[PDB]
Design a protein around this motif. Structure first.
Motif, PDB file in Angstrom:
ATOM      1  N   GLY A 247     -49.407  79.040   0.963  1.00 28.49           N
ATOM      2  CA  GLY A 247     -50.392  79.729   1.778  1.00 28.49           C
ATOM      3  C   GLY A 247     -50.442  81.204   1.415  1.00 28.49           C
ATOM      4  N   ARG A 248     -51.458  81.913   1.892  1.00 34.99           N
ATOM      5  CA  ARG A 248     -51.589  83.326   1.594  1.00 34.99           C
ATOM      6  C   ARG A 248     -51.426  84.141   2.861  1.00 34.99           C
ATOM      7  N   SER A 249     -50.588  85.175   2.766  1.00 37.49           N
ATOM      8  CA  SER A 249     -50.256  86.034   3.902  1.00 37.49           C
ATOM      9  C   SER A 249     -50.808  87.457   3.887  1.00 37.49           C
ATOM     10  N   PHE A 250     -50.854  88.047   5.079  1.00 36.22           N
ATOM     11  CA  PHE A 250     -51.333  89.408   5.287  1.00 36.22           C
ATOM     12  C   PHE A 250     -50.455  90.120   6.312  1.00 36.22           C
ATOM     13  N   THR A 251     -50.420  91.445   6.223  1.00 39.04           N
ATOM     14  CA  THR A 251     -49.704  92.265   7.187  1.00 39.04           C
ATOM     15  C   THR A 251     -50.866  92.738   8.067  1.00 39.04           C
ATOM     16  N   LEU A 252     -50.784  92.478   9.367  1.00 38.31           N
ATOM     17  CA  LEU A 252     -51.852  92.851  10.290  1.00 38.31           C
ATOM     18  C   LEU A 252     -51.891  94.336  10.618  1.00 38.31           C
ATOM     19  N   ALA A 253     -53.095  94.849  10.850  1.00 38.12           N
ATOM     20  CA  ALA A 253     -53.253  96.254  11.198  1.00 38.12           C
ATOM     21  C   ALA A 253     -52.588  96.441  12.562  1.00 38.12           C
ATOM     22  N   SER A 254     -52.602  95.372  13.352  1.00 42.60           N
ATOM     23  CA  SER A 254     -51.998  95.365  14.683  1.00 42.60           C
ATOM     24  C   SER A 254     -51.577  93.946  15.063  1.00 42.60           C
ATOM     25  N   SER A 255     -50.365  93.819  15.587  1.00 41.03           N
ATOM     26  CA  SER A 255     -49.853  92.518  15.997  1.00 41.03           C
ATOM     27  C   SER A 255     -50.663  92.033  17.200  1.00 41.03           C
ATOM     28  N   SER A 256     -51.524  92.918  17.696  1.00 41.15           N
ATOM     29  CA  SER A 256     -52.369  92.643  18.848  1.00 41.15           C
ATOM     30  C   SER A 256     -53.624  91.826  18.515  1.00 41.15           C
ATOM     31  N   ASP A 257     -54.109  91.951  17.283  1.00 45.91           N
ATOM     32  CA  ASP A 257     -55.284  91.204  16.848  1.00 45.91           C
ATOM     33  C   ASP A 257     -54.899  90.233  15.724  1.00 45.91           C
ATOM     34  N   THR A 258     -54.634  88.978  16.083  1.00 49.93           N
ATOM     35  CA  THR A 258     -54.257  87.975  15.091  1.00 49.93           C
ATOM     36  C   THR A 258     -55.383  86.985  14.794  1.00 49.93           C
ATOM     37  N   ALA A 264     -56.549  93.916   8.180  1.00 52.72           N
ATOM     38  CA  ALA A 264     -55.315  93.765   7.418  1.00 52.72           C
ATOM     39  C   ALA A 264     -55.017  95.000   6.577  1.00 52.72           C
ATOM     40  N   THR A 265     -53.839  95.576   6.781  1.00 55.02           N
ATOM     41  CA  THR A 265     -53.447  96.760   6.029  1.00 55.02           C
ATOM     42  C   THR A 265     -52.992  96.417   4.613  1.00 55.02           C
ATOM     43  N   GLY A 266     -52.581  95.168   4.405  1.00 55.43           N
ATOM     44  CA  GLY A 266     -52.144  94.748   3.088  1.00 55.43           C
ATOM     45  C   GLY A 266     -51.556  93.350   3.032  1.00 55.43           C
ATOM     46  N   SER A 267     -50.978  93.022   1.882  1.00 56.45           N
ATOM     47  CA  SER A 267     -50.355  91.726   1.659  1.00 56.45           C
ATOM     48  C   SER A 267     -49.225  91.517   2.649  1.00 56.45           C
ATOM     49  N   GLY A 268     -48.922  90.257   2.921  1.00 59.07           N
ATOM     50  CA  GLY A 268     -47.864  89.962   3.857  1.00 59.07           C
ATOM     51  C   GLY A 268     -46.524  90.156   3.195  1.00 59.07           C
ATOM     52  N   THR A 269     -45.492  90.295   4.022  1.00 57.30           N
ATOM     53  CA  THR A 269     -44.129  90.462   3.547  1.00 57.30           C
ATOM     54  C   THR A 269     -43.842  89.306   2.589  1.00 57.30           C
ATOM     55  N   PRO A 270     -43.364  89.605   1.363  1.00 52.91           N
ATOM     56  CA  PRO A 270     -43.072  88.541   0.401  1.00 52.91           C
ATOM     57  C   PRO A 270     -41.981  87.594   0.888  1.00 52.91           C
ATOM     58  N   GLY A 271     -42.087  86.328   0.488  1.00 52.27           N
ATOM     59  CA  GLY A 271     -41.122  85.322   0.894  1.00 52.27           C
ATOM     60  C   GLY A 271     -39.747  85.489   0.286  1.00 52.27           C
ATOM     61  N   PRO A 272     -38.701  85.016   0.979  1.00 49.41           N
ATOM     62  CA  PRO A 272     -37.320  85.112   0.508  1.00 49.41           C
ATOM     63  C   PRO A 272     -37.144  84.499  -0.872  1.00 49.41           C
ATOM     64  N   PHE A 273     -37.816  83.379  -1.108  1.00 48.14           N
ATOM     65  CA  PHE A 273     -37.682  82.691  -2.383  1.00 48.14           C
ATOM     66  C   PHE A 273     -38.771  82.965  -3.412  1.00 48.14           C
ATOM     67  N   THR A 274     -40.026  82.983  -2.983  1.00 47.63           N
ATOM     68  CA  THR A 274     -41.119  83.209  -3.920  1.00 47.63           C
ATOM     69  C   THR A 274     -41.258  84.653  -4.396  1.00 47.63           C
ATOM     70  N   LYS A 275     -40.784  85.605  -3.599  1.00 44.05           N
ATOM     71  CA  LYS A 275     -40.824  87.029  -3.940  1.00 44.05           C
ATOM     72  C   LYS A 275     -42.143  87.577  -4.473  1.00 44.05           C
ATOM     73  N   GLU A 276     -43.235  87.301  -3.770  1.00 40.74           N
ATOM     74  CA  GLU A 276     -44.545  87.805  -4.165  1.00 40.74           C
ATOM     75  C   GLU A 276     -45.401  88.039  -2.934  1.00 40.74           C
ATOM     76  N   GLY A 277     -45.705  89.305  -2.653  1.00 44.44           N
ATOM     77  CA  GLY A 277     -46.514  89.628  -1.493  1.00 44.44           C
ATOM     78  C   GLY A 277     -47.854  88.907  -1.485  1.00 44.44           C
ATOM     79  N   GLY A 278     -48.327  88.574  -0.294  1.00 39.41           N
ATOM     80  CA  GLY A 278     -49.599  87.896  -0.172  1.00 39.41           C
ATOM     81  C   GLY A 278     -49.498  86.392  -0.341  1.00 39.41           C
ATOM     82  N   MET A 279     -48.322  85.896  -0.730  1.00 39.00           N
ATOM     83  CA  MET A 279     -48.126  84.459  -0.914  1.00 39.00           C
ATOM     84  C   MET A 279     -46.809  83.921  -0.348  1.00 39.00           C
ATOM     85  N   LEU A 280     -46.843  82.680   0.126  1.00 40.12           N
ATOM     86  CA  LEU A 280     -45.659  82.020   0.661  1.00 40.12           C
ATOM     87  C   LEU A 280     -45.712  80.535   0.343  1.00 40.12           C
TER      88      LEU A 280
END
Length: 365
Positions: A247-258, A264-280
């Protein structure tokens, strides 16, 4: 019905439980296994990892335990680029060099065919002239494979190609009607429709558009992607619907609007194993404690959020829905990217081995 599954060359470097090698494949899970990716050296098909030769043997060795299983080697990929494809197809002499090496290479390691993953003719630095030259490449490979079958007495080598969904890329480099005739089957990359490259939240692979989506935007979905390749000439029985085990992830501008389509301010926190922002990977998404999972009614796919992290992904239900869709359209089967992104060893989602892909195997039959 086909179940085409992609194996990746670099998954062997994932750490701990996520590490993936050929020993981790299920030989009956899929009908076709495609090894990604092979490179090119002096217009010749070549390895990209120190141990491809050893892995190739293991990969194709599975056919001894399941003679029906078909394997192909995929040349190209995103990192590979376009230049080497570009220069190779510019002359009949280099094309013949490439074709002949492919034949020797494939037969040498016991592959059943070649999957073309040039990303992409007519784009990413590739001249628009590459549109027709790609067609010519496809034809040369087809003709050569045709002849090699009689000269060797073996099953004719297979030829497939991984293709983009976007109208931009498709119009720029694919003579759909011409190449469809020569390709045994077409692996449609029906994903990466939305991602962290957009400043607003969106799903990686939705089946249908959102009711409030229009114009170009209303084309960013599986259903629209399938109709385009069919309408342009691809016979349904040859169109293989690609599905993501990530799946593809994002870091929200606010945890209030999901909300879907939220800032979205940017790619989501990279996964522990995949190590690539925006993807999990799917095994990283289901490994979320204290999250809130919700489904997008319009698009038939889920997404979860926790704090300021938002990821749209595919699950058992969504896969079941897409298979149901695939059948309604009469397509040739499903494709998957990728084997190592699903919980291949049941070490995270507690749904057994290959939760997602096994779902595809059950539904497809």
């Amino acid at each position: 019905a086909k179940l085409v599954c992609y194996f990746t060359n670099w998954a062997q470097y994932r750490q701990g439980e996520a590490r993936f090698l050929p020993k981790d494949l299920d030989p009956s899970l899929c009908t076709h296994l495609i090894y990604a990716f092979a490179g090119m050296t002096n217009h010749q098909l070549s390895t990209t990892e120190w141990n491809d030769e050893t892995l190739y043997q293991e990969f194709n060795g599975l056919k001894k335990m399941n003679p029906k299983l078909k394997t192909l080697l995929a040349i190209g990929g995103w990192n590979f680029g376009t230049q080497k494809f570009t220069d190779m197809v510019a002359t009949a002499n280099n094309r013949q060099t490439f074709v002949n090496s492919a034949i020797r290479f494939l037969r040498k390691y016991s592959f059943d065919g070649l999957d073309l993953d040039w990303e992409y003719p007519g784009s990413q630095g590739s001249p628009a002239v590459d549109k027709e030259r790609f067609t010519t490449l496809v034809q040369d490979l087809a003709n050569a494979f045709q002849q090699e079958a009689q000269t060797s007495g073996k099953e004719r080598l297979l030829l497939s190609a991984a293709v983009p969904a976007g109208q931009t890329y498709v119009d720029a480099g694919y003579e759909v009607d011409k190449i469809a005739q020569n390709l045994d089957f077409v692996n449609l990359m029906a994903y990466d429709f939305h991602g962290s490259w957009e400043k607003v939240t969106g799903h990686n692979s939705p089946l249908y558009k959102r009711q409030e989506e229009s114009g170009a935007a209303a084309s960013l979905n599986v259903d629209a992607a399938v109709q385009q390749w069919l309408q342009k000439g691809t016979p349904a029985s040859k169109l293989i619907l690609g599905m993501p085990t990530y799946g593809r992830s994002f870091t929200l501008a606010s945890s209030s609007d999901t909300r879907v389509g939220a800032p979205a301010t940017g790619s989501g926190t990279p996964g522990p194993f995949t190590k690539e922002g925006g993807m999990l990977a799917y095994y990283e998404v289901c490994s979320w404690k204290g999250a809130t999972k919700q489904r997008i009614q319009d698009q038939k796919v889920p997404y979860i959020f926790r704090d300021n992290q938002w990821v749209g992904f595919d699950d058992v239900e969504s896969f079941k829905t897409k298979v149901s869709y695939l059948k309604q359209k009469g397509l040739g089967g499903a494709m998957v990217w990728a084997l190592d992104l699903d919980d291949f060893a049941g070490f995270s989602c507690n749904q057994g081995r290959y939760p997602l892909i096994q779902t595809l195997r059950q539904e497809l039959s």
